[PDB]
């Protein structure tokens, strides 16, 4: 009876930004399957949100091995919706998975980033998603115990085995990013993208990190650009948002995307109607340096 | 079965074969390019007769692409069927090629580009539509200005290491960029086989610096649209030299684009089998002299 | 009635885990080896009960080999049957390792050796018998002076590149040759993870110069036969220190092997399910400080 | 089911095995080659009786090629059937090898050469006709003077990386040509294993500088046609006289004269009679030679 | 080294083969039932030796069941491994059988019965454990009084039509229940091949009605436990009067030049209406002795009345 | 390249006779792989003989599980030659396999007609041939120790499983042929064809068998029609048989035929017989026998002279 029909004007709604120096381009706003994508959410509300995201031009869906709840269920539910709805659009989509946090019991499945854990969890995500390969394979966290040469060798073996087109890191130190990226250069596989928690209440990336991502040629995607729903000090920024044609959440998305060194911001919305309003916030005129000074004072 | 394709017993004695630069691969002096008359618009009757006539003449190289049709990708689906039903015991004697660069499927990952994602995904689609394990030459159809050649070199190299292609080439690349991507492919220990520019009597653009680049790198050259998309004003004088030599202007241009060992082949479009056997007789001509070459310009 | 395998819920709160060299892998302080009492001469009842008890105590590493029997190769098809019936969901939680270097099948390409032909054929034999896509560690087993270490390192590198193995190991290798084969593997950008020497109270040859090599290269050590093949279960002066500190001679020898971070595991080959439980209780014993350690040196070397 | 191939239990106590170059492989002193009498023109029962005898005598190395027949490629089909019916549980005890470079299928891509196109497409044919996941030694049957050796070395290197061949060898190559292709193979970290030249008593060109080349490169040597294509079976009368003075035959003398040096690891005998292979194994048991016979052979 | 196993060349010149009733299938004079000492409690090398020894003796039929262990079904898993390693090139000359009637897995559909759900599901799992595409005979291990014999007959007939069994049979069935299920199998055009009762010197219930039913039907009979579970083997020199009757039967066996086990097996096979006799798992030299039970001369009328004490 | 192209006139050469009252039409002569197709004969002579056949119109090929030597090696060789040359022409051929005599050691392979031996030997022959179904599945001999209800039930299962399009029998007595046919009709799988040994010196099928095959509508295919020699002009056993063959050959040259052509035309003299297994021979000897029907039919005088040198029946 019912079948998914991708909107014909889906590629005339959002702007696609280059991921640093690499040829891959990501939509200005991506969708992160963090919230409301496990078994806790009905499937009809999951596919309705994913269809709305694709009709607006969002082609990147960021997943992880521990996304749920329970852990690993978001990849199963997205693997079904890719089998039933997004199958003729796979070559138009950009899927990514991570491995670093806690997944299954044991010292090999909780708090690790070794070659044993990375490759076993990548094969675990490929069988849950039902895809031949992932486009980006992050390292979900920095494991100070595991040497970064072993982690770089695991990400390199994943790209050589045709299971990952690119690789990246998530919430890594600014100096450790330079280390692992040069270790990937030894394997002749470039680093694609770095995922730091970038928003108005966390300046983690603005210090000593963007200088490293630009020289390496890697892009940046902002995890939780709305401070985990906090931007939905904040009461003062809402008055600045009312000075223009945007809301508090729309102003935060435009401020994270205010510069080209940021490729996208993982939205991770819940309802579809709020997704249509979060998307298409770039047509607002850029900050006049006047508004930038006001923002920097109200929020770090 | 009734009326199954049987290739000619002496099909390898009616056409010349030229080395592709400094490699071990040869190509027929005239190749067949399925740019037109091989989509779903053209009946299978003429497609089967044209591929059989080309293989009986000695043409073993069939040039395909992701956007060849129409519609896009249709020429690979039709050649994939013609390969399964006729050219199946002759697969190891053919030379198949496939490119990826122009607009293919909607989206920034399909409508143009030469990124790693688009190159390998379009190659997987081509291996699906052709029905082969690997292609013989995987081209980069266009030069991507907003994409590092180090990424494209890593994509073409991965296509060779994964067994999905024997050799790799580039199409419509500048003279300086051909040297750059060749030195990058040489970092992956995979040589750049062939280059496909638009060599033409009404163009002659690659002679400036591209021929000097491919000759020193060991990369062969194959001429694209050698008959000027139907042309071959100025064509009236060139037609006079052809009739005063025993050719039909089309045969003169084909013998001219292969007058030097730099060019290895040319991609004939063609529509009828009778004009294809006519063009093969272009190598049945005396070599060019100093007087005829001066009158060409 | 259905059997299944209800693994112990707090099985990871029982045994301690030690890091192997400067690598991301960790291993149980006590590893279970299928050297003996896992061939076809031992019933399936004993094999299944011992593997369930060892896993319920936190032992995840199960070290095997190609010639472990008797007969030769029976220990791998017995452990493979045990994997399909019990440890099928717990695959990613386990650490399986196989070796290839001793007498297997007749012929110069069989029997002893570590050539590229013998290593890849014996690895495909083990992967077919075990029923796993890959092994976590793959050792070279004994060293062969006739085969160049460039070909052995090339086969070990081709084993991890083909997805058949994740880590590379060696066993009973000379101290200098361990440095040589490690540098050749580092040329392939493939690290050496673990060396498995025979380390116990009566054979302390590894402390001479082998431990100084594994620590420098960043590779751990698994002590094969830490009880002198059953001789620690004159050593009666050691049996006096067994009554002291509240333990036994076997529990004293294990804790003595697990001194510093160089030793990552002690490959034990117990059989009785109850002695396996009492041997894991040898970790919480207090260290040897200085004087208690200087008493073991009387009846050592 | 009526009767299957039961290998001789004393097969590995018959022939002594020699090491090939500075590698881990150890080839037998004598190796049966399928150059002739293994096509469709030879009955199958004589092939099965000959291969059962070779393996019973301790021979573990079987040499094949893409063009062995007649017709071309039929020897790999006949050996493939005999493998799946008899030698299937003995697969890991054998050393199979195939060649590619002379004349196979019609066309410039098949009638010869050593291009990457022809080397991989002919190896795919050999792996499907033999019925094995890999050959043990993949050869380049002849040096291609018109194809750069950087491409042939790349094809031989990918043959090992794809798991199609454990080792790479060359055959009918020159002296400096072997050195320049082995130096290029050492860049891919796939060392050249063995060279297969024509080395017998009537053709001693390999002793010039090919023997010194393979000794320094670490590669072994296997002799092709040690009886000069059957001319030394039984001019040759002077060699037959020295053979009788030593207690052997002309075939056994020319066989032991090939295996006299350590840098000649094996010889490819292509006999047809099963009673003949048993009388060539009795050529290495004889005592070694000395001065008054080596200087008298010449 | 090399553990390849080839059967004895004279294995088919050892014992005789009796025809199953009036069909075409023959069975060895003594079969090998894997009831005891073939589960996970017994080492696999011991079972491997006993199977290789039995086949070299000519024993071609191997009687299995879904509950043979312990634990349940472990005998089918061990025989499946011994088949894929040793008995693979001898499959087309082996006769294999499996059953489904007693408690196997938890549940009302697993606590035994003759239902179509339990029969076809237990046969599918018994085919996976054995590693074979089909079994030669598929028994109905017990008679379920709560399930009609029309559903059980259609279940066995479905097993033959689906290529999972060549012949079918019934075990431990009544004499009237044998005539009933056989008459219903004639409707499916798949006749009842063989019946497996318990028949020995002490358990002679089948003589009254059963042997007459299988004769007029055309089926065969295979004798289960013809040694009364070690009571007719001299291992016990389970009541005192049972031990005294055994010593009396042994004295009549030593006058014939046999042992007590050889006497009981030859007594079971005294009439051609009986086709085989299941030999349990034992030591190899004990199987060699009991297999040579038909080599004795046939019983006389005075000897048969002498043992009918 | 070095492949096989069937002759275009192959279906305009030999005639085709209807198999009793069915829809199957076999060639007037067939090719049985009884001998000279095992591992003792080179595959090239087998290939050239199977290519000479079929080019002459020989579409039917008669095999058996024990055809060799060794036993079964003929089905393996014909399986390879079919996979290499005859794969596109598979639906234009009629392949048959049998099972009834000694095959593998044991009481279940040494002869018999039981359901176990028939289905096992059919699955063996299907794996060696490389085809998923044979066109005809014969019962090679009559088993007196096995009921015909079980043998007919095994043949009926072979058709319903998709492993055989039709079934037949060989060396069956006339009364036993009629009994197994009435049993097969209960399975709605009619008996297609019967294969008896029928030639000039062995005419037992004329007594009662040919009437049974005609009433049932089953065809007949003649096995050993040239009497394993003594009818091919090569021996020109026993001396009385040499005089009978010399007298028959004289009648053959009177009508322009050879001794082999005369015997093959005599077996095919009416519609009851449908074909005759020629067997392996040299290429020119196959072509000469194929055109045996190209001759005037037998008259009353010629048939009478032939009976003076043959047996009654």
Three-state SS for chain D is CCCCCCCCCCHHHCCCEEECCCCCCEEECEEEECCCCCCCCCCHHHHHHHHHHHHHCCCCEEECCCCCCCCCCHHHHHHHHHHHHCCCCCHHHCEEEECCCCCCCCCCCCCCCCCHHHHHHHHHHHHHHHCCCCEEEECCCCCCCCCCHHHHHHHHHHHHHCCCEEEEEEECCCCHHHHHHHHHHCCCCCCEEEEECECCCCCCCCCCCHHHHHHHHCCEEEEECCCCCCCCCCCHHHHHHHHHHCCCCHHHHHHHHHCCCCCCCEEEECCCCHHHHHHHHHHCCCCCCCHHHHHHHC
Could you tell me the maximum CA-CA distance found in chain E, to the nearest angstrom? 56
B128 Cβ under 8 Å from any chain A Cβ: no
Could you tell me which residues are beta bridge partners of residue A17?
A: A26
- List of residues 6+ apart from A122 with CB closer than 8 A: A97, A99, A134, A137, A158, A163, A164
3-class SS at B82?
helix
Q: At what angle do helices C236-243 and C249-257 cross, to 10 degrees?
A: 90
SS percent in chain F: helix, strand, coil, step 5: 40, 15, 45
C and B touch with 3+ CB pairs <8 Å, answer no
Locate tokens 């049985």: which residue? F32
Mutate to test the interface with B, among A14, A91, A135 (most CBs of B within 10 A): A91
Closest CA to E279 of E270, E289, C72, E271: E289
Closest CA to C284 of C264, C255, C244: C255
A142 Cβ under 8 Å from any chain C Cβ: no
- List of residues 6+ apart from D53 with CB closer than 8 A: D274, D277, D278
Closest CA to F64 of F76, F56, F72: F72
Asked if A3 contacts A12 with a C-beta cutoff of 8 angstroms, the reply is no
d(CA B219, CA B225) in angstroms, rounded, equals 19
Tokens standing for F131? Answer: 């085809």
- List of residues 6+ apart from B113 with CB closer than 8 A: A23, B101, B144, B147
Asked if C269 contacts C38 with a C-beta cutoff of 8 angstroms, the reply is no
Which secondary structure element, helix H or strand E, spans residue E277, and what is its range? Answer: strand E276-279
* Torsion from C-alpha of D282, D287, D292, D297, nearest 10 degrees: 20
3-class SS at A215?
helix
d(CA B20, CA B265) in angstroms, rounded, equals 9
Q: Do B89 and F1 touch (CB under 8 A)?
A: yes
Tokens standing for F201? Answer: 């010196």
Tokens standing for F29? Answer: 């002569």
Which secondary structure element, helix H or strand E, spans residue B80, and what is its range? Answer: helix B74-85
Collect all residues of chain C within an 8 Å Cβ-Cβ radius of residue D160.
158
Burial-class residue E218 by CB neighbours within 10 Å (0-12, 13-18, 19+): middle
d(CA D123, CA D168) in angstroms, rounded, equals 12
Q: Do A150 and C218 touch (CB under 8 A)?
A: no
Collect all residues of chain D within an 8 Å Cβ-Cβ radius of residue F77.
44
User: Over the Cα atoms of chain B, what is R_g?
Assistant: 19
d(CA D105, CA B79) in angstroms, rounded, equals 23
In terms of phi and psi (left: phi > 0; alpha: psi -120 to 50; beta: otherwise), the region of C24 is: alpha
Closest CA to C277 of C50, C7, C44, C34: C50
Beta strands in F196-268 (DSSP E): 219-222
3-class SS at E165?
strand
d(CA F107, CA E26) in angstroms, rounded, equals 7
- Residue A170: half-sphere exposure toward Cβ, Cα within 13 Å: 21
- List of residues 6+ apart from C271 with CB closer than 8 A: C36, C37, C42, C46, C50
- List of residues 6+ apart from C82 with CB closer than 8 A: C47, C48, C51
Taking CA atoms, C298 is separated from C263, C281, E98, in Å, by 22, 25, 65
- List of residues 6+ apart from B233 with CB closer than 8 A: none
C18 Cβ under 8 Å from any chain A Cβ: no
Instruction: For chain C, give the secondary structure using H, E and C.
Output: CCCCCCCCCCHHHCCCEEECCCCCCEEECEEEECCCCCCCCCCHHHHHHHHHHHHHCCCCEEECCCCCCCCCCHHHHHHHHHHHHCCCCCCCCCEEEECCCCCCCCCCCCCCCCCHHHHHHHHHHHHHHHCCCCEEEEECCCCCCCCCHHHHHHHHHHHHHCCCEEEEEEECCCHHHHHHHHHHHHHCCCCEEEEECECCCCCCCHHHHHHHHHHHHCCEEEEECCCHHHCCCCCHHHHHHHHCCCCCHHHHHHHHHCCCCCEEEEEECCCCHHHHHHHHCCCCCCCCCCHHHHHHHHHCC
Burial-class residue B158 by CB neighbours within 10 Å (0-12, 13-18, 19+): buried
Closest CA to B253 of B274, B220, B222, B279: B279
Asked if C42 contacts C81 with a C-beta cutoff of 8 angstroms, the reply is no
Show the CA angle centred on residue A272, arms to residues A270 and A276, nearest 5°. Answer: 115
Collect all residues of chain F within an 8 Å Cβ-Cβ radius of residue E60.
106-108
Asked if A23 contacts B116 with a C-beta cutoff of 8 angstroms, the reply is yes
Residue E169 dihedral angles phi and psi, to the nearest 5°: -160, 175
Collect all residues of chain F within an 8 Å Cβ-Cβ radius of residue D106.
1
3-class SS at A193?
strand
In this complex, the chains that touch F, judged by 3 or more CB pairs closer than 8 A, are B, D, E
Asked if B54 contacts B28 with a C-beta cutoff of 8 angstroms, the reply is no
Asked if A166 contacts A136 with a C-beta cutoff of 8 angstroms, the reply is yes
Closest CB to A106 among C12, C161, C191: C12
Tokens standing for D233? Answer: 């079976």
User: What are the residue ranges of helices labelled H in B95-135?
Assistant: 116-130
Asked if F200 contacts F225 with a C-beta cutoff of 8 angstroms, the reply is no
Asked if B254 contacts B266 with a C-beta cutoff of 8 angstroms, the reply is yes
Asked if E73 contacts E112 with a C-beta cutoff of 8 angstroms, the reply is no
3-class SS at A13?
coil
Closest CA to E185 of E170, E207, E197: E170
Which secondary structure element, helix H or strand E, spans residue F233, and what is its range? Answer: none
Distance from CA of E114 to the nearest CA of C (A): 19
Cited resolution, angstroms: 3.0
Helix and strand counts by DSSP (H, E) for chain A = 10, 10
Closest CA to D89 of D194, D4, D28: D4
Closest CA to B65 of B106, B114, B100: B100
Tokens standing for D279? Answer: 């009388």
State whether the Cα torsion E221-E222-E224-E225 is positive or negative.
positive
Mutate to test the interface with D, among F1, F65, F79 (most CBs of D within 10 A): F1
Mutate to test the interface with F, among E60, E92, E217 (most CBs of F within 10 A): E92
Write E10-14 long-range contacts (CB < 8 A, 24+).
E11/E55, E11/E56, E11/E57, E11/E58, E12/E58, E12/F105, E12/F106, E12/F107, E13/E58, E14/E57, E14/E58, E14/E291
Tokens standing for A110? Answer: 């909780």
* Torsion from C-alpha of B173, B174, B177, B179, nearest 10 degrees: 100
A22 Cβ under 8 Å from any chain B Cβ: yes
d(CA A72, CA A49) in angstroms, rounded, equals 19
CB pairs D-E closer than 8 Å: 9
Distance from CA of F75 to the nearest CA of E (A): 18
Locate tokens 């048993």: which residue? D278
Asked if E134 contacts E97 with a C-beta cutoff of 8 angstroms, the reply is no
d(CA A300, CA A204) in angstroms, rounded, equals 11
Closest CB to D2 among F41, F71, F80: F71
Closest CB to F114 among E22, E25, E161: E25
Closest CA to B135 of B194, B47, B197, B210: B194
d(CA D12, CA E237) in angstroms, rounded, equals 52
Q: Do C92 and A108 touch (CB under 8 A)?
A: yes
Tokens standing for F49? Answer: 């003989």
Tokens standing for A199? Answer: 């928003």
Mutate to test the interface with D, among C108, C145, C154 (most CBs of D within 10 A): C108
Q: At what angle do helices F259-267 and F240-254 cross, to 10 degrees?
A: 90
Neighbours of E270 (CB within 10 A): 12
Which secondary structure element, helix H or strand E, spans residue A181, and what is its range? Answer: helix A174-186
d(CA C227, CA D256) in angstroms, rounded, equals 53
Tokens standing for C126? Answer: 């083990």
Asked if D93 contacts D56 with a C-beta cutoff of 8 angstroms, the reply is no
User: What are the residue ranges of helices labelled H in chain E?
Assistant: 44-56, 74-85, 116-130, 149-161, 175-185, 210-217, 240-254, 260-268, 284-291, 301-307
Closest CA to C76 of C60, C88, C65: C65
User: Over the Cα atoms of chain D, what is R_g?
Assistant: 19
Helix and strand counts by DSSP (H, E) for chain E = 10, 10
Locate tokens 């660069």: which residue? B101
- List of residues 6+ apart from C215 with CB closer than 8 A: C21, C262
Neighbours of A250 (CB within 10 A): 20
d(CA C38, CA C74) in angstroms, rounded, equals 8
d(CA D210, CA D216) in angstroms, rounded, equals 10
Show the CA angle centred on residue E10, arms to residues E8 and E15, nearest 5°. Answer: 110
Q: D268-278 b/e with 16+ CB inside 10 Å = b?
A: bbbbeebeebe
Q: Do F2 and D48 touch (CB under 8 A)?
A: no
| Minimum CA–CA partner of E110 in chain C | C1
Asked if F113 contacts F142 with a C-beta cutoff of 8 angstroms, the reply is yes
d(CA F22, CA E131) in angstroms, rounded, equals 41
d(CA C104, CA B50) in angstroms, rounded, equals 60
Collect all residues of chain D within an 8 Å Cβ-Cβ radius of residue B136.
117
B1 Cβ under 8 Å from any chain F Cβ: yes
Could you tell me which residues are beta bridge partners of residue F277?
A: F30
Asked if F292 contacts F260 with a C-beta cutoff of 8 angstroms, the reply is yes
Which secondary structure element, helix H or strand E, spans residue F60, and what is its range? Answer: strand F60-62
d(CA F284, CA D102) in angstroms, rounded, equals 36
Distance from CA of B148 to the nearest CA of A (A): 7
Distance from CA of B244 to the nearest CA of D (A): 34
Neighbours of B286 (CB within 10 A): 9
Tokens standing for B203? Answer: 């163009």
Neighbours of F192 (CB within 10 A): 26
Q: At what angle do helices E175-185 and E210-217 cross, to 10 degrees?
A: 20
d(CA B224, CA A61) in angstroms, rounded, equals 41
Distance from CA of D227 to the nearest CA of C (A): 27
User: Over the Cα atoms of chain E, what is R_g?
Assistant: 19
Burial-class residue F12 by CB neighbours within 10 Å (0-12, 13-18, 19+): exposed
State whether the Cα torsion E216-E217-E221-E224 is positive or negative.
negative
């Amino acid at each position: 009876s019912m079948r998914y029909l991708a909107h014909p004007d889906r590629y005339d709604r959002i702007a696609y930004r280059r991921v640093g120096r690499s040829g891959l381009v990501l939509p200005a706003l991506s969708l992160g399957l963090w919230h409301n994508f496990g078994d806790s959410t009905p499937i009809d509300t999951q596919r309705a949100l994913l269809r709305t995201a694709f009709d607006l031009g969002i082609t990147h869906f960021d997943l992880a091995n521990n996304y749920g709840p329970p852990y690993g269920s978001a990849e199963i539910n997205f693997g079904r919706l890719l089998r039933e709805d997004f199958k003729p659009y796979r070559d138009e989509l950009i899927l990514s998975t991570k491995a670093g946090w806690d997944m299954w019991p044991g010292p090999y499945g909780q708090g690790g980033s070794s070659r044993k854990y990375l490759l076993s969890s990548l094969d675990q995500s490929l069988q849950r998603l039902g895809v031949d390969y992932v486009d980006i394979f992050y390292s979900h966290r920095f494991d100070a115990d595991t040497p970064l040469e072993e982690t770089a060798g695991a990400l390199a073996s994943a790209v050589q085995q045709g299971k990952a087109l690119y690789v990246g890191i998530s919430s890594y130190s600014a100096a450790r990013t330079r280390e692992i990226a040069a270790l990937l250069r030894a394997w002749k596989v470039p680093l694609l993208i770095h995922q730091p928690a970038y928003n108005l209440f966390n300046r983690w990336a603005e210090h000593e990190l963007f200088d490293a991502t630009a020289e390496l040629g890697a892009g940046v995607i902002a995890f939780t650009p709305l401070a985990q729903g906090l931007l939905t000090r904040a009461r003062g920024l809402d008055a600045i948002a009312r000075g223009r044609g945007q809301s508090l959440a729309q102003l935060a998305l435009a401020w994270v995307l205010r510069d080209a060194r940021v490729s996208s911001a993982l939205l991770g919305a819940s309802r579809p109607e709020q997704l249509i309003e979060n998307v298409a916030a770039l047509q607002a005129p850029p900050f006049s340096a006047e508004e930038l000074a006001e923002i920097d004072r109200h929020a770090v």
